[PDB]
Structure 1
Amino acid sequence: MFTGSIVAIVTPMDEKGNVCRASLKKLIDYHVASGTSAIVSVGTTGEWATLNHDEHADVVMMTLDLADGRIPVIAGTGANATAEAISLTQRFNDSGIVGCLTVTPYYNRPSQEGLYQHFKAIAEHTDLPQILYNVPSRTGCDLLPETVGRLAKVKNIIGIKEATGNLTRVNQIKELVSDDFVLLSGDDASALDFMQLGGHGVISVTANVAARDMAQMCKLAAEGHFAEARVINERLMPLHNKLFVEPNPIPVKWACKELGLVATDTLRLPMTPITDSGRETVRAALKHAGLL
């Protein structure tokens, strides 16, 4: 549910940019069969950025309908205005999602005290578990360990997706929070290292195309079998890097199409079609992973 390999699932689209239900069903079945712990619906990799609030709700509800109770769903619910994050969250209360993934405000660069008031207010108006989401390269704001410590005292703020790739954050956060607070990597390339230092899992792009291997790697890491998990990570390392050779989710949607998991690799502007050179790098990564 909030540990192990969690996929940040693509939002598959037809040629017009509308959600492809048939493609989504195939992905969801794939994750159920491959042992993925949960699905993050309309996260970053799900083009949270370019869906409107309504389309967003629809993809989440569709994922819940297709999932049919077989795999837990977490929805992306972040916003850069605290009133808007509260309002959006209300739409998912009692939807069937198990939790919300809520990103630090982007663009407006609030203070730490602002982040604290933001997240505390969101949490106050829902019974759903909240997972905080720190990704400074995208938002311009860095939610620091001291603030995560203050927010972890709020009953339903249950963990953090830490996407800095700065592995010192693991034990800085861990020492400030209770043993039940969940630490999840949001950086596939450093995620095994993150788990080895005491993290609990990963919210992953790679998992979209290597679900079984991600699931086994995370299970080995949780049991302490790091040498063994590292053999898997070494085969997935080209994917961990090359799925970001052009802006995510351009590479992963192309990989999903190439494997046949989705009908088209279409995305919404300002995301553009993968370049020829990108296709070649991604294909080589897929073959390194044994997927083609």
Structure 2
Amino acid sequence: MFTGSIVAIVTPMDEKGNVCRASLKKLIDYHVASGTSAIVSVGTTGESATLNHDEHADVVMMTLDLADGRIPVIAGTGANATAEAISLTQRFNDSGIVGCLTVTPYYNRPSQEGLYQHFKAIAEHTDLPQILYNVPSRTGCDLLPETVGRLAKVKNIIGIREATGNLTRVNQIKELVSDDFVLLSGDDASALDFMQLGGHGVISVTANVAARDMAQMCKLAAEGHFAEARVINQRLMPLHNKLFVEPNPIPVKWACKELGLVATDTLRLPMTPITDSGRETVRAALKHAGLL
């Protein structure tokens, strides 16, 4: 539910940029059948940036509806204003989601004390489990281990998705927090290393198109079978890298279309269509993963 392979699922769109219910349904059936532990609905990969809060809620509600209890859903709920973050959380109260993935404020670059108050205030006004999300390359702000240790003492802050790719953070955080605080990778290419060092899972972009391998790899990692997991990781590694050859979620939406998982690879501005060179590189990485 908060461990293993968690997908950061795309928000499939028609050619007009509106959510495509039929494509979303295919994806959810795909994850239920493939053994994905949970779905993150409307995070970065789900184009949270270019959906308004109303569309955002509709997509999360649609996802719960289609999931029909077969797989846990986590809603993305971050905002760079504490009052908006709180307010967005309230829309999901008593909805069926099992928790929230909430990002560090982007753009306004708060202090560590500001991060602590941001996340503490969010956790206060919900009964829902909160997972902190740290991705400094996008936000301009880095949530430090010391601060995670402070926040972990809050009852319903249950874990962190760490996307720096800085693997020393695993044990710096682990020393400061209780044994049931969940550490998740937010970086596909370093996620197996992350789990090998003590991590419990990954919120994965690769899982959109290689769900079964990711789930097996995460299960082997959790059992301590790292060599066996590493074999699968090597065949996924080109995907781990090339899904980011052009801005995420551009390559992965195109890959979902190439596999037939979604009807179109349409995105919203300022995301733009994949280049021909991009297609060639992604295609080669899909073939290396044995998916084409």
Q: Classify the TM-score, shorter chain.
A: over 0.9
After superposition, give the CA deviation of every residue in 1:23-57 in whole Å (9 maximum; x if it has no partner).
00000000000000000000110000110000000
Shift of 1:153: 0.0
Please list every run of at least 4 consecutive aligned residues from structure 1 whose deviation after the TM superposition is greater than 2 angstroms. Answer: none
Deviation digits for residues 140-163 of structure 1 (CA, Å, limit 9, x no counterpart): 000000000000000000000000
Match of 1:43 in 2: 43
In 1, Cα distance between equivalents of 2:81 and 2:256: 34
Q: How far apart, in 2, do the equivalents of 1:91 and 1:59 lie?
A: 12
Query: Is 1:116 aligned to 2:116, yes or no?
Result: yes
> CA–CA distance in 2 between the matches of 1:204 and 1:146?
25
- Segments of 5+ residues of structure 2 without an aligned counterpart are none
Give 3-state SS (helix, strand or coil) of 2:23's partner. helix
Deviation of 1:271 (Å): 0.2
Q: CA offsets, 1:270-291, max 9 Å, x none?
A: 0000000000000000000000
Q: What is the rounded CA distance, in whole Å, between the counterparts of 2:123 and 2:145 in structure 1? A: 18
3-state SS of 1:180 partner: coil
Deviations 1:128-186 (A, max 9, x none): 00000000000000000000000000000000000000000000000000000000000
- Render the CA deviation track for 1:171-205: whole Å, top value 9, x for unaligned: 00000000000000000000000000000000000
Segments of 5+ residues of structure 1 without an aligned counterpart are none
Give the Å deviation of 1:222.
0.2
Between the two proteins, the alignment pairs up a number of residues equal to: 292
C-alpha displacement at 1:92, in angstroms? 0.2
How far, CA to CA, are the matches of 1:126 and 1:276 in structure 2? 46
Equivalent-residue separation in structure 1 for 2:146 and 2:229 (angstroms)? 31
Q: 1:90: Cα distance to partner?
A: 0.3
Counterpart CA distance in 1 for 2:196 and 2:44 is: 25
Shift of 1:120: 0.1
Give the Å deviation of 1:87: 0.6
- Name the SS of the counterpart of 2:230 in structure 1: helix
Matches within 5 A, 1:96-111: 96-111=96-111
Structure 2 CA distance, aligned partners of 1:81 and 1:282?
A: 36
Aligned pairs for 1:18-97 within 5 A: 18-97=18-97
* Paired residue secondary structure (1:92): coil
Instruction: For residue 64 of structure 1, report the CA deviation from its aligned partner.
Output: 0.2
Residue 252 of structure 1 deviates from its aligned partner by 0.1
Separation (CA, whole Å) in 2 of partners of 1:95 and 1:266: 28
Q: Report 1:115-154 matches (<5 A).
A: 115-154=115-154
Partners in 1 of 2:46 and 2:234 — Cα distance? Answer: 26
Q: Percent identity?
A: 99
Q: How does the TM-score come out when normalised to structure 2?
A: 1.00
The separation in 2 between residues aligned to 1:55 and 1:187, in whole angstroms, is: 27
Task: Tell me, in whole angstroms, the C-alpha distance in 2 between the residues paired with 1:34 and 1:221.
Answer: 17
State how far apart, in whole Å, the 1-side matches of 2:234 and 2:291 are. 14
1:220, distance to aligned residue in structure 2 (A): 0.1
Give, in angstroms, the shift of residue 98 of structure 1.
0.1
Rounded Cα–Cα distance in structure 1 between residues aligned with 2:183 and 2:246: 27
Q: Distance in 2 between matches of 1:70 and 1:14?
A: 25
1:283 aligned counterpart, secondary structure: helix
**Alignment partner of 2:192: what SS?**
helix
Shift of 1:211: 0.2
Q: Work out the CA distance in 1 between the residues paired with 2:247 and 2:71.
A: 28
Deviation at 1:105, TM superposition (A): 0.2
CA distance in 2: counterparts of 1:218 and 1:76, whole angstroms: 22
TM superposition shift of 1:262 = 0.2
